[PDB]
């Protein structure tokens, strides 16, 4: 319980894969590390587990330094993608395996195995051998071993990637109810943002080894710190329009839309380090675009793609005011054929603004679900 990373760094030769990670994981917290493949998610969990050495920095688990502690003496349990079960043990044996080495009454053993067995949809396979199960079933068995063991700290490296879409959904639900009941510290890694939003108490976004941002789900969604975070968090990606600053004021920045459309708009974002003439990036999420019974800033274009998902419609629009096609989301079924002329509004209070260095001008509009000043 309780994990602290103080300037933890990792490097292979002259390549740095983990750069000065600073994290304070509180006891019982559910922390998700997210980012694309190659950003250093597994290397980080492996350093916590003691399966990789820490180049520099200190790692604390339960207040004690663990840099030099052997894997099995750190109080952690780890599960990962396509875990290999012991071929000669029965499902039940593979699930109680961790708890047995750690010593424990058979009473506690069977109690947990049975419980975890139900939760993970495996109570009927208890007596079979792993060779007789599906890839989805073995993975669940692997997850179960650690859940039965109940280590002081759970480390899960993309544990659900081996499951059908439907099973991932149910497993996420089960992982959540398990964390609530056990209250144990859990560090979970995924490349999937939806999963991070759903499971995490707090999320840490990794970008090629660096911590881009750490915060609650909504803190990342409403107030991303840079373009990377803004475009990583949010099912269908945030729209980005290249803009040019034309004026600045107290807690306010004005920009001009690109290409032909040269319309100027005021955005309620901090002017801190913004300078007239700066080429910047304007961000607006598909779900945040308005339907246009006049919003005072309108973009009109030609439908390129239309996705009917039943619960909602995702329209791809080509704006004559030239760029990349403006994705729009609206609830329920929206009737429009791929070719029509669709017009949507652009709400200033919902716009994000990124400098050339990618950093963001702090939005000042107050969003629900995130602690705000005043």
Ligand X SMILES: Nc1ncnc2c1ncn2[C@@H]1O[C@H](COP(=O)(O)OP(=O)(O)O)[C@@H](O)[C@H]1O
* Interface residues toward a copy of itself, by CB under 8 A: 36-38, 134-136, 161-162, 164-166, 169, 173, 176-177, 180, 190-195, 197-198, 217-218, 221-222, 232-237, 285, 287, 305, 307-312, 329, 331-333, 335, 367-369
Based on the shown chain and the rule CB under 6 A, indicate whether residue 40 belongs to the binding site for ligand X: yes
b/e for 154-167, b at 16 or more Cβ within 10 A? bbbbbbbebbeeeb
In the bound state with a copy of itself, the residue whose beta carbon lies nearer, of 62 and 358, is 358
Residue 162 binds Mg ion (CB under 5 A): no
18 among annotated binding-site residues: no
* Tokens standing for residue 259: 């290409």
User: Which residue sits closest to Mg ion, CB atoms considered?
Assistant: 42
Stretch that binds ligand X, among 34-42, 294-302, 326-334, 347-355 (CB under 6 A): 34-42
Q: Least Å distance between CB 28 and ligand X?
A: 25
Asked if residue 41 binds ligand X (CB under 6 A), the reply is yes
User: Six-digit token pair at 52?
Assistant: 């990789």
369 counts as binding ligand X under rule CB under 6 A: no
Q: How far is the CB of 229 from ligand X (least distance, A)?
A: 16
Residue in 38, 71, 260, 320 binding ligand X, rule: CB under 6 A: 38
The Cβ-side half-sphere exposure at 173, using a 13 Å CA radius, reads: 8
12 near ligand X, judged by CB under 6 A: yes
Q: Is 43 near ligand X (CB under 6 A)? A: yes
Q: Which of the listed partners (ligand X, Mg ion, a copy of itself, none) does 40 bind, with a CB threshold of 5 to 8 Å by partner kind?
A: ligand X
Q: Kindly tell me which of 162 and 213 has the beta carbon lying closer to Mg ion.
A: 162
Which residue, 16, 18, 216, is CA-closest to 7?
Answer: 18
- Residue 67 to residue 49: CA distance in whole angstroms: 10
CA distance 224 to 31: 18
Q: How far apart are CA 271 and CA 282, in angstroms?
A: 14
Minimum distance from residue 10 beta carbon to ligand X (Å): 8
Nearest by Cα to 196 from 227, 167, 219, 162? 219
* Among 265, 179, 267, 228, residue whose Cα is nearest residue 359: 228
Can you say whether residue 121 is alpha, beta or left, with left for phi > 0 and alpha for psi between -120 and 50 degrees? left
Is position 42 an interface residue for ligand X (rule: CB under 6 A)?
A: yes
User: Which of Mg ion, a copy of itself, ligand X, none sits in contact with 12, Cβ below 5 to 8 A by type?
Assistant: ligand X
* Nearest to 236, CA basis, from 326, 336, 152: 326
Interface with Mg ion (CB under 5 A), residue from 4, 33, 35, 42: 42
**Which own/partner contact pairs does 293-296 have at CB distance under 8 Å and 24+ positions apart?**
294/345, 295/345, 295/346, 295/347
Q: Is 159 annotated as a binding residue?
A: no
Distance CA 256, CA 267 (A): 11
The alpha-carbon radius of gyration of the chain (Å, integer) is: 24
Phi-psi region of 138 (alpha: psi -120 to 50; beta: other; left: phi over 0): alpha
Whichever of 39 and 178 has its CB closer to ligand X, that residue is 39
Q: Which is nearer to a copy of itself, 236 or 358 (CB)?
A: 236
Q: Show Cβ contacts of residue 140 under 8 Å, excluding neighbours closer than 6 positions.
A: 120, 121, 122, 163, 171
Does 50 participate in binding ligand X (rule CB under 6 A)?
no
Contact between 18 and Mg ion per CB under 5 A: no
Question: Which is closer to a copy of itself, CB of 20 or CB of 201?
Answer: 201
Would the annotation count 231 as a binding residue?
no
Q: Which residue has the tokens 């919902």?
A: 350
320 marked as part of a ligand binding site: no
Report the distance separating Cα 200 and Cα 176, nearest Å.
9
**Binding site residue list:** 35-42
Interface residue list for Mg ion (CB under 5 A): 41-42
Interface residue list for ligand X (CB under 6 A): 12, 15, 17, 37-43
**Binding site residue list for ATP:** 35-42
């Amino acid at each position: 319980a309780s994990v602290q990373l103080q300037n933890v760094t990792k490097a292979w030769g002259e390549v740095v894969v983990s750069k000065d990670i600073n994290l304070d994981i509180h006891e019982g917290e559910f922390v998700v590390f997210v980012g694309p493949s190659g950003c250093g998610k597994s290397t980080l969990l492996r350093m916590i587990a003691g399966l990789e050495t820490i180049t520099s920095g200190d790692l604390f688990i339960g207040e004690k330094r663990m840099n030099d502690t052997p894997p099995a003496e750190r109080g952690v349990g780890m599960v990962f993608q396509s875990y290999a079960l012991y071929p000669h043990l029965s499902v039940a044996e593979n699930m109680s395996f961790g708890l047995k080495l750690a010593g424990a009454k058979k009473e506690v053993i069977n109690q947990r195995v049975n419980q975890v067995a139900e939760v993970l949809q495996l109570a009927h396979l208890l007596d079979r051998k792993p060779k007789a199960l599906s890839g989805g079933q073995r993975q669940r068995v692997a997850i179960g071993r650690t859940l039965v063991a109940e280590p002081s700290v759970f480390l899960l490296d993309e544990p659900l990637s081996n499951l059908d879409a439907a099973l991932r959904v149910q497993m996420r639900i089960e992982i959540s109810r398990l964390h609530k009941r056990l209250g144990r510290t859990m560090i979970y890694v995924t490349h999937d943002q939806v999963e991070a939003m759903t499971l995490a108490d707090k999320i840490v976004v990794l970008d090629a080894g660096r911590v881009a941002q750490v915060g609650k789900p909504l803190e990342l969604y409403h107030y991303p710190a840079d373009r990377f975070v803004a475009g990583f968090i949010g099912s269908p990606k945030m729209n980005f329009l290249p803009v040019k600053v034309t004026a600045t004021a107290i807690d306010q920045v004005q920009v001009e839309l690109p290409m032909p459309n040269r319309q100027q708009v005021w955005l309620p974002v901090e002017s801190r380090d913004v300078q007239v003439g700066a080429n910047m990036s304007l961000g607006i999420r598909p779900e945040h675009l308005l339907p246009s019974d006049i919003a005072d800033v309108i973009l009109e274009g030609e439908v390129q793609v239309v996705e009917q998902l039943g619960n909602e419609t995702q329209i791809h629009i080509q704006i004559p005011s030239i760029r990349q096609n403006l994705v729009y989301r609206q609830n329920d079924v929206v009737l429009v054929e791929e070719g029509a002329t669709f017009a949507i509004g652009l709400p200033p209070e919902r716009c994000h603004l990124f400098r050339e260095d990618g950093t963001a001008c702090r939005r000042l509009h107050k969003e629900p679900g995130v602690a705000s000043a005043s």
